Design a protein around this ligand. Structure first.
Ligand SMILES: Nc1nc2c(c(=O)[nH]1)N(C=O)[C@@H](CNc1ccc(C(=O)N[C@@H](CCC(=O)O)C(=O)O)cc1)CN2
Ligand SMILES: Nc1nc2c(c(=O)[nH]1)N(C=O)[C@@H](CNc1ccc(C(=O)N[C@@H](CCC(=O)O)C(=O)O)cc1)CN2
Length: 362
Protein backbone atom coordinates (compact mmCIF):
# COMPACT_ATOMS: atom_id res chain seq x y z
CA UNK A 1 0.00 0.00 0.00
CA UNK A 2 1.00 3.62 -0.53
CA UNK A 3 2.12 5.44 2.61
CA UNK A 4 1.88 9.16 3.35
CA UNK A 5 4.77 11.20 4.87
CA UNK A 6 3.15 10.69 8.30
CA UNK A 7 2.78 6.90 8.18
CA UNK A 8 5.45 6.35 10.85
CA UNK A 9 3.75 8.87 13.14
CA UNK A 10 0.46 6.98 12.88
CA UNK A 11 2.11 3.64 13.66
CA UNK A 12 4.04 5.11 16.59
CA UNK A 13 0.73 6.52 17.85
CA UNK A 14 -0.65 2.98 17.85
CA UNK A 15 -3.36 3.62 15.27
CA UNK A 16 -5.36 0.82 13.68
CA UNK A 17 -4.26 0.89 10.04
CA UNK A 18 -6.61 0.10 7.16
CA UNK A 19 -6.43 0.15 3.35
CA UNK A 20 -8.15 3.23 1.91
CA UNK A 21 -7.98 3.74 -1.85
CA UNK A 22 -4.70 1.82 -1.87
CA UNK A 23 -3.29 3.88 1.01
CA UNK A 24 -2.25 2.48 4.38
CA UNK A 25 -4.18 4.87 6.63
CA UNK A 26 -5.33 5.16 10.26
CA UNK A 27 -8.97 4.18 10.81
CA UNK A 28 -8.64 5.51 14.35
CA UNK A 29 -6.10 6.03 17.12
CA UNK A 30 -8.29 5.59 20.18
CA UNK A 31 -11.84 5.12 18.91
CA UNK A 32 -14.00 6.56 16.15
CA UNK A 33 -16.43 8.01 18.71
CA UNK A 34 -13.77 9.72 20.80
CA UNK A 35 -12.27 11.26 17.68
CA UNK A 36 -15.61 12.49 16.37
CA UNK A 37 -16.32 14.13 19.72
CA UNK A 38 -12.93 15.84 19.60
CA UNK A 39 -13.94 17.32 16.24
CA UNK A 40 -17.33 18.39 17.67
CA UNK A 41 -15.97 19.75 20.96
CA UNK A 42 -12.35 20.86 20.61
CA UNK A 43 -10.17 19.82 17.69
CA UNK A 44 -9.43 16.76 15.60
CA UNK A 45 -6.39 16.63 13.34
CA UNK A 46 -6.47 14.48 10.19
CA UNK A 47 -3.67 13.35 7.89
CA UNK A 48 -5.23 13.69 4.42
CA UNK A 49 -2.00 13.57 2.43
CA UNK A 50 -3.44 10.87 0.16
CA UNK A 51 -5.56 13.55 -1.52
CA UNK A 52 -4.23 14.82 -4.83
CA UNK A 53 -3.20 18.32 -5.85
CA UNK A 54 -2.92 19.62 -9.40
CA UNK A 55 -1.32 22.87 -10.45
CA UNK A 56 -2.61 24.86 -13.43
CA UNK A 57 -0.12 27.53 -14.53
CA UNK A 58 -0.37 29.92 -17.43
CA UNK A 59 -2.06 33.08 -18.81
CA UNK A 60 -5.34 31.21 -19.29
CA UNK A 61 -5.53 29.37 -15.95
CA UNK A 62 -8.82 31.06 -15.08
CA UNK A 63 -10.73 30.37 -18.31
CA UNK A 64 -9.39 26.80 -18.35
CA UNK A 65 -10.66 26.03 -14.84
CA UNK A 66 -13.96 27.75 -15.65
CA UNK A 67 -14.29 25.46 -18.68
CA UNK A 68 -13.57 22.32 -16.65
CA UNK A 69 -15.66 22.86 -13.51
CA UNK A 70 -19.39 23.52 -13.15
CA UNK A 71 -19.08 26.38 -10.65
CA UNK A 72 -18.26 29.98 -11.60
CA UNK A 73 -14.50 30.53 -11.46
CA UNK A 74 -14.44 33.35 -14.05
CA UNK A 75 -14.57 36.13 -11.47
CA UNK A 76 -13.35 34.46 -8.27
CA UNK A 77 -10.83 36.90 -6.75
CA UNK A 78 -7.30 36.08 -5.58
CA UNK A 79 -7.09 34.13 -2.33
CA UNK A 80 -10.50 32.55 -2.79
CA UNK A 81 -11.27 28.82 -2.97
CA UNK A 82 -14.39 27.23 -4.42
CA UNK A 83 -16.20 23.89 -4.11
CA UNK A 84 -17.38 22.32 -7.34
CA UNK A 85 -17.89 19.25 -9.46
CA UNK A 86 -16.25 18.36 -12.78
CA UNK A 87 -18.50 16.62 -15.33
CA UNK A 88 -18.08 14.63 -18.53
CA UNK A 89 -19.87 15.36 -21.82
CA UNK A 90 -23.00 13.57 -20.62
CA UNK A 91 -23.23 15.57 -17.39
CA UNK A 92 -22.04 12.71 -15.22
CA UNK A 93 -19.84 13.64 -12.26
CA UNK A 94 -16.17 12.81 -12.74
CA UNK A 95 -15.24 14.07 -9.28
CA UNK A 96 -15.97 16.81 -6.80
CA UNK A 97 -13.14 19.11 -5.74
CA UNK A 98 -11.87 22.37 -4.33
CA UNK A 99 -10.04 24.87 -6.54
CA UNK A 100 -7.89 27.72 -5.22
CA UNK A 101 -7.51 30.96 -7.19
CA UNK A 102 -3.94 31.95 -6.37
CA UNK A 103 -3.62 34.46 -9.20
CA UNK A 104 -4.78 34.95 -12.80
CA UNK A 105 -1.84 32.74 -13.79
CA UNK A 106 -2.13 30.04 -11.13
CA UNK A 107 -4.86 27.78 -9.76
CA UNK A 108 -4.61 24.76 -7.45
CA UNK A 109 -6.92 21.74 -7.61
CA UNK A 110 -7.41 19.37 -4.66
CA UNK A 111 -9.09 16.09 -5.57
CA UNK A 112 -10.00 12.78 -3.94
CA UNK A 113 -7.35 10.08 -3.49
CA UNK A 114 -8.97 7.34 -5.58
CA UNK A 115 -9.33 9.57 -8.64
CA UNK A 116 -5.94 11.28 -8.96
CA UNK A 117 -5.01 9.36 -12.13
CA UNK A 118 -8.46 9.63 -13.72
CA UNK A 119 -8.74 13.33 -12.87
CA UNK A 120 -5.25 14.23 -14.08
CA UNK A 121 -5.73 12.49 -17.43
CA UNK A 122 -9.11 14.17 -17.85
CA UNK A 123 -7.78 17.64 -17.06
CA UNK A 124 -4.73 17.25 -19.32
CA UNK A 125 -6.69 15.90 -22.28
CA UNK A 126 -8.75 19.11 -22.10
CA UNK A 127 -5.96 21.69 -21.86
CA UNK A 128 -5.27 21.52 -25.60
CA UNK A 129 -6.93 24.83 -26.50
CA UNK A 130 -5.77 26.73 -23.41
CA UNK A 131 -2.50 28.53 -22.71
CA UNK A 132 -1.74 26.59 -19.54
CA UNK A 133 0.47 23.81 -18.24
CA UNK A 134 -1.08 21.21 -15.94
CA UNK A 135 1.12 19.49 -13.38
CA UNK A 136 0.55 16.87 -10.68
CA UNK A 137 2.32 17.79 -7.42
CA UNK A 138 0.65 15.11 -5.28
CA UNK A 139 3.79 12.99 -5.02
CA UNK A 140 5.57 15.70 -3.00
CA UNK A 141 2.66 17.42 -1.27
CA UNK A 142 1.15 16.81 2.16
CA UNK A 143 -2.18 17.99 3.52
CA UNK A 144 -3.32 18.20 7.14
CA UNK A 145 -6.85 19.09 8.29
CA UNK A 146 -7.13 20.77 11.71
CA UNK A 147 -10.89 20.76 12.46
CA UNK A 148 -13.01 21.86 15.40
CA UNK A 149 -14.59 24.78 17.33
CA UNK A 150 -11.22 25.34 18.99
CA UNK A 151 -9.18 24.91 15.80
CA UNK A 152 -8.29 28.58 15.29
CA UNK A 153 -7.33 29.38 18.90
CA UNK A 154 -5.15 26.26 19.13
CA UNK A 155 -3.40 26.71 15.76
CA UNK A 156 -2.74 30.47 15.88
CA UNK A 157 0.39 30.38 18.06
CA UNK A 158 2.19 28.37 15.37
CA UNK A 159 1.24 30.69 12.49
CA UNK A 160 3.15 33.90 11.71
CA UNK A 161 0.00 35.58 10.34
CA UNK A 162 -3.40 36.27 11.92
CA UNK A 163 -5.88 33.49 11.17
CA UNK A 164 -8.96 35.66 11.75
CA UNK A 165 -8.09 37.50 8.54
CA UNK A 166 -8.62 34.27 6.59
CA UNK A 167 -12.30 33.96 5.66
CA UNK A 168 -14.23 30.76 4.98
CA UNK A 169 -13.15 29.27 1.66
CA UNK A 170 -10.23 31.69 1.49
CA UNK A 171 -6.52 31.04 1.98
CA UNK A 172 -3.10 32.61 2.27
CA UNK A 173 0.51 31.49 1.98
CA UNK A 174 2.09 31.68 5.42
CA UNK A 175 4.48 29.91 7.76
CA UNK A 176 3.36 27.24 10.22
CA UNK A 177 5.76 25.75 12.75
CA UNK A 178 8.55 27.35 10.75
CA UNK A 179 7.58 25.86 7.38
CA UNK A 180 5.97 27.22 4.22
CA UNK A 181 2.30 26.32 4.33
CA UNK A 182 -0.77 27.24 2.34
CA UNK A 183 -3.40 27.78 5.04
CA UNK A 184 -7.07 27.70 4.03
CA UNK A 185 -10.19 28.01 6.14
CA UNK A 186 -11.75 24.89 4.67
CA UNK A 187 -12.77 21.45 5.83
CA UNK A 188 -14.97 18.38 5.49
CA UNK A 189 -16.47 18.29 9.00
CA UNK A 190 -19.13 20.95 9.50
CA UNK A 191 -17.03 22.67 12.16
CA UNK A 192 -14.73 25.67 11.81
CA UNK A 193 -11.22 24.70 10.81
CA UNK A 194 -8.28 24.80 8.43
CA UNK A 195 -6.34 22.67 5.99
CA UNK A 196 -2.57 22.98 5.80
CA UNK A 197 -0.90 22.24 2.49
CA UNK A 198 2.87 21.86 2.55
CA UNK A 199 5.79 19.94 1.09
CA UNK A 200 5.77 16.30 2.19
CA UNK A 201 9.27 16.58 3.67
CA UNK A 202 7.97 19.05 6.28
CA UNK A 203 4.86 17.09 7.23
CA UNK A 204 6.44 15.33 10.25
CA UNK A 205 7.59 18.56 11.90
CA UNK A 206 4.26 20.36 11.52
CA UNK A 207 2.33 17.33 12.74
CA UNK A 208 4.52 16.95 15.85
CA UNK A 209 4.18 20.64 16.69
CA UNK A 210 0.40 20.39 16.32
CA UNK A 211 0.23 17.17 18.38
CA UNK A 212 2.00 18.97 21.22
CA UNK A 213 -0.76 21.60 21.20
CA UNK A 214 -3.66 19.15 20.93
CA UNK A 215 -2.75 17.46 24.21
CA UNK A 216 -2.87 20.87 25.86
CA UNK A 217 -6.54 21.40 25.00
CA UNK A 218 -7.67 17.77 25.04
CA UNK A 219 -7.75 17.58 21.24
CA UNK A 220 -7.10 14.38 19.28
CA UNK A 221 -5.45 13.07 16.13
CA UNK A 222 -8.38 11.72 14.08
CA UNK A 223 -8.51 8.93 11.53
CA UNK A 224 -10.63 8.10 8.51
CA UNK A 225 -13.37 6.55 10.62
CA UNK A 226 -14.12 9.92 12.21
CA UNK A 227 -13.58 11.68 8.90
CA UNK A 228 -16.47 9.73 7.37
CA UNK A 229 -18.78 10.14 10.37
CA UNK A 230 -18.27 13.91 10.55
CA UNK A 231 -18.65 14.44 6.80
CA UNK A 232 -21.85 12.36 6.76
CA UNK A 233 -23.26 14.24 9.74
CA UNK A 234 -22.38 17.49 7.95
CA UNK A 235 -24.05 15.87 4.95
CA UNK A 236 -21.16 16.50 2.53
CA UNK A 237 -20.87 14.03 -0.34
CA UNK A 238 -18.23 11.34 -0.78
CA UNK A 239 -17.39 10.65 -4.42
CA UNK A 240 -17.75 7.02 -5.43
CA UNK A 241 -20.33 6.36 -2.74
CA UNK A 242 -22.91 9.15 -2.97
CA UNK A 243 -22.22 10.15 -6.58
CA UNK A 244 -20.24 9.01 -9.64
CA UNK A 245 -20.44 9.28 -13.42
CA UNK A 246 -23.90 7.73 -13.37
CA UNK A 247 -25.36 10.72 -11.49
CA UNK A 248 -25.53 14.34 -12.60
CA UNK A 249 -25.18 17.17 -10.02
CA UNK A 250 -28.91 17.92 -9.88
CA UNK A 251 -29.71 14.38 -8.74
CA UNK A 252 -27.47 14.56 -5.68
CA UNK A 253 -28.32 18.03 -4.41
CA UNK A 254 -25.38 19.85 -5.99
CA UNK A 255 -27.40 22.18 -8.20
CA UNK A 256 -25.90 25.16 -6.37
CA UNK A 257 -22.39 24.47 -7.71
CA UNK A 258 -23.62 24.41 -11.33
CA UNK A 259 -23.78 27.73 -13.20
CA UNK A 260 -25.55 27.10 -16.51
CA UNK A 261 -25.17 30.74 -17.54
CA UNK A 262 -21.59 29.92 -18.50
CA UNK A 263 -19.93 27.46 -20.87
CA UNK A 264 -18.30 24.29 -19.52
CA UNK A 265 -17.90 20.58 -20.19
CA UNK A 266 -21.28 18.91 -19.82
CA UNK A 267 -23.18 22.19 -20.14
CA UNK A 268 -25.61 21.12 -22.88
CA UNK A 269 -26.25 17.75 -21.25
CA UNK A 270 -26.95 19.46 -17.93
CA UNK A 271 -29.40 21.93 -19.48
CA UNK A 272 -31.57 19.03 -20.60
CA UNK A 273 -30.96 17.16 -17.33
CA UNK A 274 -32.16 20.14 -15.28
CA UNK A 275 -35.50 19.99 -17.11
CA UNK A 276 -36.17 16.49 -15.75
CA UNK A 277 -34.66 15.70 -12.35
CA UNK A 278 -36.05 12.26 -11.50
CA UNK A 279 -33.83 11.41 -8.54
CA UNK A 280 -32.79 13.07 -5.28
CA UNK A 281 -30.42 12.31 -2.42
CA UNK A 282 -32.26 12.19 0.89
CA UNK A 283 -31.07 11.98 4.49
CA UNK A 284 -32.32 9.00 6.48
CA UNK A 285 -32.45 8.25 10.19
CA UNK A 286 -32.87 4.51 10.75
CA UNK A 287 -34.28 2.78 13.80
CA UNK A 288 -31.80 0.70 15.76
CA UNK A 289 -28.03 0.42 15.76
CA UNK A 290 -27.45 -1.36 12.44
CA UNK A 291 -25.58 0.71 9.84
CA UNK A 292 -26.89 0.72 6.25
CA UNK A 293 -24.44 0.00 3.43
CA UNK A 294 -24.26 1.23 -0.16
CA UNK A 295 -26.58 -0.81 -2.36
CA UNK A 296 -29.16 -1.76 0.27
CA UNK A 297 -32.54 -1.28 -1.39
CA UNK A 298 -34.83 1.44 -0.11
CA UNK A 299 -38.59 0.86 -0.16
CA UNK A 300 -41.76 2.86 0.50
CA UNK A 301 -44.72 0.74 1.60
CA UNK A 302 -43.33 -2.27 -0.24
CA UNK A 303 -42.23 -0.51 -3.43
CA UNK A 304 -38.59 0.23 -4.27
CA UNK A 305 -37.80 3.93 -4.54
CA UNK A 306 -34.01 3.77 -4.56
CA UNK A 307 -30.93 2.61 -2.68
CA UNK A 308 -28.56 3.57 0.15
CA UNK A 309 -25.42 5.45 -0.89
CA UNK A 310 -23.70 6.09 2.44
CA UNK A 311 -24.30 4.97 6.01
CA UNK A 312 -22.75 5.24 9.46
CA UNK A 313 -23.64 5.74 13.11
CA UNK A 314 -23.76 9.30 14.38
CA UNK A 315 -22.65 9.74 17.99
CA UNK A 316 -23.59 13.42 17.69
CA UNK A 317 -27.26 12.57 17.11
CA UNK A 318 -26.99 9.09 18.63
CA UNK A 319 -28.62 7.54 15.56
CA UNK A 320 -27.89 5.29 12.60
CA UNK A 321 -27.97 7.68 9.62
CA UNK A 322 -27.72 7.39 5.85
CA UNK A 323 -27.86 9.08 2.47
CA UNK A 324 -29.99 7.46 -0.25
CA UNK A 325 -30.59 8.03 -3.94
CA UNK A 326 -34.34 7.72 -4.39
CA UNK A 327 -37.11 8.78 -6.76
CA UNK A 328 -38.29 12.39 -6.82
CA UNK A 329 -41.53 11.29 -5.13
CA UNK A 330 -39.86 10.66 -1.76
CA UNK A 331 -40.36 13.51 0.72
CA UNK A 332 -39.25 14.57 4.19
CA UNK A 333 -41.33 12.83 6.84
CA UNK A 334 -41.81 9.70 4.72
CA UNK A 335 -41.51 6.35 6.47
CA UNK A 336 -39.27 4.14 4.35
CA UNK A 337 -37.81 0.67 4.64
CA UNK A 338 -34.19 -0.35 4.13
CA UNK A 339 -33.54 -3.95 3.13
CA UNK A 340 -30.59 -5.41 5.02
CA UNK A 341 -28.95 -8.71 3.98
CA UNK A 342 -31.32 -11.65 4.30
CA UNK A 343 -34.36 -9.55 3.39
CA UNK A 344 -34.56 -7.85 6.79
CA UNK A 345 -36.46 -4.55 6.67
CA UNK A 346 -35.24 -1.69 8.85
CA UNK A 347 -37.47 1.35 9.25
CA UNK A 348 -36.09 4.75 8.31
CA UNK A 349 -37.37 8.30 8.45
CA UNK A 350 -36.58 10.88 5.79
CA UNK A 351 -35.33 14.05 7.51
CA UNK A 352 -34.32 17.53 6.37
CA UNK A 353 -30.68 18.00 5.30
CA UNK A 354 -28.18 18.47 6.77
CA UNK A 355 -28.14 16.17 9.82
CA UNK A 356 -25.89 18.57 11.74
CA UNK A 357 -24.10 21.90 11.35
CA UNK A 358 -21.43 22.92 13.82
CA UNK A 359 -19.13 25.91 14.18
CA UNK A 360 -18.59 26.36 10.30
CA UNK A 361 -18.93 30.06 8.68
CA UNK A 362 -18.61 32.20 5.28
N1 LIG B 1 -9.29 21.03 0.05
C1 LIG B 1 -10.10 19.92 0.02
N2 LIG B 1 -10.37 19.41 -1.20
C2 LIG B 1 -11.16 18.31 -1.37
C3 LIG B 1 -11.76 17.61 -0.21
C4 LIG B 1 -11.42 18.23 1.14
O1 LIG B 1 -11.88 17.71 2.20
N3 LIG B 1 -10.61 19.35 1.18
N4 LIG B 1 -12.60 16.43 -0.52
C5 LIG B 1 -12.80 15.56 0.41
O2 LIG B 1 -13.47 14.52 0.33
C6 LIG B 1 -13.23 16.21 -1.86
C7 LIG B 1 -14.45 17.13 -2.05
N5 LIG B 1 -15.50 16.92 -1.08
C8 LIG B 1 -16.02 17.97 -0.40
C9 LIG B 1 -17.44 18.06 -0.20
C10 LIG B 1 -18.00 19.19 0.49
C11 LIG B 1 -17.14 20.21 0.97
C12 LIG B 1 -17.64 21.45 1.67
O3 LIG B 1 -16.91 22.14 2.39
N6 LIG B 1 -18.92 21.81 1.45
C13 LIG B 1 -19.52 23.01 2.03
C14 LIG B 1 -19.09 24.11 1.06
C15 LIG B 1 -19.56 25.50 1.46
C16 LIG B 1 -19.15 26.59 0.48
O4 LIG B 1 -18.45 26.33 -0.64
O5 LIG B 1 -19.47 27.75 0.73
C17 LIG B 1 -21.02 22.78 2.03
O6 LIG B 1 -21.54 21.91 1.17
O7 LIG B 1 -21.77 23.37 2.79
C18 LIG B 1 -15.73 20.10 0.77
C19 LIG B 1 -15.17 19.00 0.09
C20 LIG B 1 -12.17 16.56 -2.94
N7 LIG B 1 -11.44 17.79 -2.62
N1 LIG C 1 8.85 34.93 7.09
C1 LIG C 1 8.46 34.54 5.82
N2 LIG C 1 7.14 34.65 5.57
C2 LIG C 1 6.61 34.31 4.37
C3 LIG C 1 7.44 33.79 3.27
C4 LIG C 1 8.93 33.69 3.61
O1 LIG C 1 9.74 33.25 2.73
N3 LIG C 1 9.35 34.07 4.87
N4 LIG C 1 6.73 33.46 2.02
C5 LIG C 1 7.38 33.54 0.91
O2 LIG C 1 6.98 33.32 -0.22
C6 LIG C 1 5.27 33.07 2.01
C7 LIG C 1 5.03 31.70 2.70
N5 LIG C 1 5.60 30.57 2.03
C8 LIG C 1 4.84 29.85 1.17
C9 LIG C 1 5.19 29.79 -0.21
C10 LIG C 1 4.37 29.04 -1.09
C11 LIG C 1 3.21 28.35 -0.62
C12 LIG C 1 2.37 27.59 -1.62
O3 LIG C 1 1.36 28.07 -2.15
N6 LIG C 1 2.77 26.34 -1.95
C13 LIG C 1 2.05 25.54 -2.90
C14 LIG C 1 2.98 25.54 -4.11
C15 LIG C 1 2.40 24.79 -5.30
C16 LIG C 1 1.54 25.69 -6.18
O4 LIG C 1 1.32 27.00 -5.93
O5 LIG C 1 1.02 25.18 -7.17
C17 LIG C 1 1.85 24.17 -2.22
O6 LIG C 1 1.95 24.10 -0.89
O7 LIG C 1 1.59 23.14 -2.84
C18 LIG C 1 2.86 28.41 0.75
C19 LIG C 1 3.68 29.16 1.65
C20 LIG C 1 4.56 34.15 2.87
N7 LIG C 1 5.27 34.42 4.12
Amino acid sequence: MKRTPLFEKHVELGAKMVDFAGWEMPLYYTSIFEEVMAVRKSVGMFDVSHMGEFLVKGPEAVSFIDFLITNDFSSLPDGKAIYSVMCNENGGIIDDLVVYKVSPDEALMVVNAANIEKDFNWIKSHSKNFDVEVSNISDTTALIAFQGPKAQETLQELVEDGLEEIAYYSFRKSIVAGVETLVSRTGYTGEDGFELMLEAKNAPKVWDALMNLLRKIDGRPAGLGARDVCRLEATYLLYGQDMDENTNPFEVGLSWVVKLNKDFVGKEALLKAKEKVERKLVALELSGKRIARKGYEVLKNGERVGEITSGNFSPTLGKSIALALVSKSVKIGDQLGVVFPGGKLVEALVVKKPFYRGSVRR
